[PDB]
Amino acid sequence: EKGVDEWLEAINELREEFSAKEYLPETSLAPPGQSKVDLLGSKIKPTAEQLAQWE
């Protein structure tokens, strides 16, 4: 089952990367090529009918 094989290879590589350093959400789970996240939206997008009425 390559699906379970590659998933199980992806889960253990992640374990090692997080193990290398103290696991902190902001740092350990930063975006690719990024220093760290801020663990901090409900700005609903107007629907096409809502926006048409406003226009």
Partner: peptide, 11 residues
């Protein structure tokens, strides 16, 4: 007026 804002918050 306060109840109409839920239907379209843009107004």
């Amino acid at each position: 007026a306060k109840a109409l804002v839920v239907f379209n918050p843009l107004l």
